[PDB]
Write a protein that binds this ligand. Structure first.
Ligand SMILES: Cc1cc(-c2ccco2)ccc1NCc1ccc(CN2C[C@H](O)[C@@H](O)[C@H](O)[C@H]2CO)cc1
Length: 765
């Protein structure tokens, strides 16, 4: 019956606007298939369209804002786009209609409305671009009656093994079509919808902007050749209207020009389903999806005081929709260095110079192809899977739709190699690559990232212990199905656990280090003089110089997180021998955190290193790192150490700002130095961890209950209000917040773990 649930999940999730790297586009969860994308831009001159056209997501002066107002990947959503440069407010509605055997049908409305500043007669070019990859696939534009293009709908008829038969329609739409009185109109028509059907090698189909401009340039060349010149030029918009040439091919460009406001529909009808999808279907199903979104939001994200007001609701709906709306399907090769050069072992002083020499051998090669279904940090900047980010993304998503979350976890775990490594950054395919500077593309099999996906698994387990609607929770409602999922995933979790212990081992035995256990000690590979990217806390100060004898307290705590998860899942599956090993490791980590990491002098956990004189030294930089055993839930509610940690957390002159906890203490010598990435700013992911743990202590009999209750109440309020105020002023979720001013800074559109704020508001952990 697990198989039955699987098949239904497949069919439910198959279609989506799963191209979050562009403003609007669709693809199914199939590597080589049918994809769509939208382009638009004002044209006011003979050279401006190349500058105004929109396709891939950006953020700059020219774009006021954009995002999903509502979204569920099972149903669809509505997106808003505020384009200043092009003077347009755009709505893209997307809806899915179940039926047939190929994942069902879908429809989109594209609505553009000029803003108040735009000339009332602005000419806007709109393109709908369709490509299909596959060896045994076909797609064909049905030709027009009229001489020069289309008066009505453009109909494309296609077929593939993946999709069966289907028809994709781009409706006539509503709005003024400009008409040219020029001579050229005798040969090109006065102005109408046009279609060009082209073919290119499959691997370049994603390059829509270049493909389009190539056709425009061919058009212009034709003009010059046929004596259309500056003595009497056609209007710009006619110059950039493609000559109509529909047919078969693996690329179809549908182009319309509007003057003033416009709208039009895209209808994808799966043949194996009922009758074909209509505009009337679109309208009714859009209304229906909104009703269902509304009701689920109110159940799942019931915002508690003092955030129960309508303004906080709108805020919460926007943050959540942007997060879940960011879900993409990615397909293609990864760039991996599979040399396992010995320099990557980092057993020497100065290991970072050796490692750089090894990287400069460029042994990396493409491998796969792989696929991934994942949410993302950011559409305009980071539209791809990041390993420890996805842990935080899935916490709110799991509340919404646990089955969708387990799908994404499975997607991630299917990327794991036989060693137990999953690359921390998943750049699949040339499209995905196009956004990443070369320096940053190669993955290294010795680079870890925090195992945050285990947190999501813990939430699932507690829910398990204690048709779209049915499917969204099938995995907890049918305990047989939940256990089966765990049974299959469990070995991969164990493999990753063992991988951590093998590749991220620290060195106890080779120095003068006494501690309860000789095994438990950890060091992130991959550190440079100034960085430790693999830990997630890019530039958080660490022992100088980096050294093979370093030990990292955050890493040890992540291992504790993992082993606790394995005990809970192992128990469920009756893995007796496994549980007993995990139990000895938990016990060991618990003692060793104290023996190697706890500083009595400073009253917090510290990274460790090895002296000029080969002795163990604590290196203390008060900040998120210092709190880790607490953030990760490893300390007993009655612990004196916890006591000291709560004092640090609450201390205004260290970590506690009006706007949240500082990444680094104001008293640290590295406060606000260098790029100041994790050396003062307030980060929502770590604050979220603090908030959940504070609440944990507040809701249990114990000596710190009341202290925790106070800090929980204040921190919750500080974090939410900072995100909300910024969202109100700017439209944006930000990557981090300034603890002096509360201003959002770094990257916009970070939804992104900033979105955890909906979960903070709804509370009741
Ligand atoms: C300099 C640069 C430019 C562009 C670009 C130019 C035009 C469009 O894109 C893309 C990448 C890069 N540099 C790498 C990078 C930098 C920052 C992040 C965000 N972020 C940092 C956290 O510290 C991590 O914990 C977290 O996992 C992680 C993902 O959220 C991720 C990657």
């Amino acid at each position: 019956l697990h198989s039955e649930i699987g098949r239904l999940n497949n069919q439910s999730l198959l279609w989506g606007p799963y191209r979050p790297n562009i403003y609007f586009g669709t693809r199914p969860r199939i590597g080589k298939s049918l994809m769509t994308g939208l382009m638009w831009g004002k044209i006011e001159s003979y050279t401006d369209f190349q500058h105004t056209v929109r396709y891939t997501c950006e953020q700059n002066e020219g774009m006021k804002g954009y995002g999903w107002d509502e979204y569920d990947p099972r149903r669809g959503g509505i997106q808003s786009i505020h384009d200043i440069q092009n003077g347009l407010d755009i709505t893209t509605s997307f809806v899915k209609i179940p039926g047939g055997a190929h994942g069902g049908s879908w429809a989109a409305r594209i609505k553009g409305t000029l803003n108040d500043d735009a000339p009332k007669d602005q000419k806007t070019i709109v393109v709908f671009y369709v490509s299909q990859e596959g060896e045994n696939s076909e797609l064909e534009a049905v030709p027009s009656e009229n001489e020069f293009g289309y008066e009505g709908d453009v109909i494309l008829k296609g077929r593939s093994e993946a999709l069966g038969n289907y028809k994709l329609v781009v409706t006539k739409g509503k709005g003024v079509i400009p008409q040219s009185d020029h001579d050229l109109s005798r040969l090109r028509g006065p102005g109408q919808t046009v279609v060009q059907s082209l073919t290119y090698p499959d691997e370049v189909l994603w390059q829509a902007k270049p493909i389009l401009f190539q056709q425009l340039k061919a058009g212009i060349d034709w003009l010059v050749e046929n004596k259309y010149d500056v003595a009497d030029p056609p209007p710009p918009w006619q110059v950039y209207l493609l000559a109509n040439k529909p047919g078969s091919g693996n690329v179809h460009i549908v182009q319309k020009v509007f003057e003033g406001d416009f709208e039009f529909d895209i209808l994808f009808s799966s043949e194996s389903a009922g009758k074909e999808v209509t505009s009337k279907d679109l309208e009714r199903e859009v209304k229906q999806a909104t009703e269902v979104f509304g009701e689920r939001f109110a159940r799942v994200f019931d915002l508690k005081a003092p955030f129960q007001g309508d303004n906080y609701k709108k805020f919460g709906k926007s943050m959540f929709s942007n997060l879940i709306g960011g879900i993409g399907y990615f397909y293609g090769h990864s760039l991996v260095d599979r040399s396992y050069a010995p320099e990557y072992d980092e057993e020497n002083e100065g290991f970072w110079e050796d490692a750089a020499e090894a990287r400069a051998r460029h042994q990396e090669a493409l491998e796969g192809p792989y696929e991934l279904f994942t949410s993302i940090p950011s559409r305009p900047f980071f539209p791809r899977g990041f390993l420890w980010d996805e842990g935080f993304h899935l916490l709110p998503i799991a509340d919404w739709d646990i089955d969708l979350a387990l799908e994404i976890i499975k997607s991630w775990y299917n990327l794991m190699d036989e060693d137990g490594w999953i690359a921390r950054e998943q750049i699949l395919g040339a499209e995905a690559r196009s956004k990443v500077p070369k320096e940053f593309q190669t993955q290294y099999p010795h680079y870890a990232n925090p195992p945050t996906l285990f947190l999501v698994l813990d939430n699932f387990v507690e829910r398990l212990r204690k048709l779209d609607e049915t499917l969204s929770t099938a995995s907890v409602d049918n305990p047989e199905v939940g256990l089966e999922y765990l049974r299959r995933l469990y070995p991969l979790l164990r493999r990753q656990f063992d991988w951590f212990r093998k590749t991220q081992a620290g060195d106890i035995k080779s120095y003068d280090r006494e501690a309860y256990s000789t095994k438990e000690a950890y060091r992130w590979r991959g550190r440079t003089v100034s960085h430790c990217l693999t830990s997630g806390l890019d530039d958080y100060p660490r022992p100088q110089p980096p050294h093979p004898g370093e030990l990292h307290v955050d890493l040890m705590s992540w291992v504790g997180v993992m082993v606790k998860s394995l005990i809970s899942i192992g128990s469920l599956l009756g893995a007796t021998e496994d549980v007993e090993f995990y139990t000895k490791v938990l016990d060991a980590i618990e003692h060793n955190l104290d023996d190697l990491h706890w500083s009595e002098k400073e009253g917090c956990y510290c990274d460790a290193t090895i002296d000029e004189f080969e002795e163990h030294k604590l290196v203390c930089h008060k900040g998120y790192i210092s709190l880790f055993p607490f953030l990760t839930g490893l300390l007993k509610p009655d612990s004196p150490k916890l006591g000291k940690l709560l004092a640090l957390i609450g201390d205004e002159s260290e970590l506690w700002s009006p706007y949240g906890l500082r990444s680094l203490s104001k008293k640290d010598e590295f406060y606000g130095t260098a790029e100041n990435y994790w050396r003062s700013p307030v980060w929502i992911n770590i604050n979220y961890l603090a908030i959940v743990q504070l609440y944990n202590i507040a809701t249990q009999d114990g000596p710190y209950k009341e202290t925790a209750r106070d800090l929980y109440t204040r921190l919750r309020k500080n974090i939410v209000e900072t995100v909300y105020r910024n969202w109100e002023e700017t439209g944006f979720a930000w990557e981090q917040y300034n603890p002096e001013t509360g201003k959002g800074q770094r990257t916009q559109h970070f939804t992104g773990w900033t979105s955890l704020v909906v979960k903070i508001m709804s509370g009741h952990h």
